[PDB]
Amino acid sequence: SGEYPTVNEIPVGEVRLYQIADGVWSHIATQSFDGAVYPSNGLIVRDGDELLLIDTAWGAKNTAALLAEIEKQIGLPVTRAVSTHFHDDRVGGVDVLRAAGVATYASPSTRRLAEAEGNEIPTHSLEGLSSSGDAVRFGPVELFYPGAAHSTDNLVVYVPSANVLYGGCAVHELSSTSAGNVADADLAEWPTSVERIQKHYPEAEVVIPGHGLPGGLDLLQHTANVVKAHKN
Ligand SMILES: C[C@H](c1cnn(CCCN)c1)c1cccc2c(-c3ccc(CS(C)(=O)=O)c(F)c3)c(C(=O)O)[nH]c12
Ligand SMILES: [Zn+2]
Ligand SMILES: [Zn+2]
């Protein structure tokens, strides 16, 4: 009824949208992994009379549900999608998207890693993002490669019309007490990658983590802090 929806409010398989700013929504879904249930976020950005999707809803049936929810609540077609790293909470559902006519994109680094993991593989490669600090435009967003953090390939997304920073899994929510799933992370480089985000997007007004509640720029420093406590 208005507050951001949390893991225990979303049954696995359903998707909810949350209006972030004019023409910007997050999408929230939940999924089981190794016997526990987790929420995860993605983004939807209006692109004239079309929509740009950032990240799947973590699984084929969740992603089908995402498309249905977008049709019900927004009613504009999703024409393109970008996945911000290779894990299943970002690419699982790409095959559903591709069968629904969505053009799916990721960096070559994400595509390679997805293929090697046995995860679904976006169709199109995003060049111009291979060195930390790189930025490219993609529809109504800017894609930025901050360097290795949660994963070596993680991208962040900025919506300049609204000053919305979508951190993906490189950014954690304020209530987080540890650094999430770090199996593919670079804990030593993560703070430097966060500092690059902070320097490049000093006017961000909303910061959205890969999992959990949006907030403001605090999420960036908090992320660095929880990652340092983990490496320690
Ligand atoms: C799909 C993904 C994954 C990551 N790696 N692998 C290994 C490769 C295997 N094929 C799979 C995955 C599965 C389960 C949970 C998480 C969390 C996560 C966990 C806990 C928290 C709470 S917290 C910050 O307080 O610790 C959280 F927010 C997110 C994150 C994240 O961190 O992005 N990914 C997750
Ligand atoms: Zn991940
Ligand atoms: Zn994640």
40 neighbors 28 (Cβ within 8 angstroms): yes
Residues in contact with ligand 1 (CB, 6 Å cut-off): 33, 38, 87-89, 117, 150, 169, 172, 176-181, 183-184, 210-212
**Cα dist. 42→5, 34, 102, 147, 202 in Å?**
13, 21, 16, 20, 22
Nearest ligand 1 atom, CA 58: 1
Token pair listed for 101: 């006519």
Tokens 């023409």 label which residue? 23
Token pair 């111009």 is at which residue? 128
87 is catalytic: yes
* Ligand 1 pocket mutation pick from 211, 222, 227 by most atoms within 8 angstroms of CB: 211
Identify the three-state secondary structure at position 110.
Answer: helix
Residue 50 burial (10 A CB sphere; 0-12, 13-18, 19+): middle
Question: How were these coordinates obtained?
Answer: X-ray
Is 186 a known active-site residue?
no
CA of 51 to the centre of ligand 3 (A): 22
Parallel, antiparallel, or unpaired: how do β-strands 156-159 and 164-168 relate? antiparallel
Instruction: Indicate which residue's Cα is closest to atom 34 of ligand 1.
Output: 181
Tell me how far the alpha carbon of residue 92 lies from the centroid of ligand 3, in angstroms: 12
Tally Cβ neighbours within 10 Å of residue 35.
5
State the ligand closest to the CA atom of 152: 2
Report resolution (Å) to 1 decimal. Answer: 1.2
Sheet of 24-33, strand order = 15-21, 24-33, 36-47, 50-54, 78-82, 103-106, 124-125
Candidates 27, 41, 47, 87; catalytic one: 87
Is 150 a known active-site residue? Answer: yes
* 204 closest CA partner among 138, 156, 169: 156
Ligand 1, pocket-test mutation among 87, 181, 219, 222, most atoms within 8 A of CB = 181
Superfamily covering domain 7-231 = Ribonuclease Z/Hydroxyacylglutathione hydrolase-like (3.60.15.10)
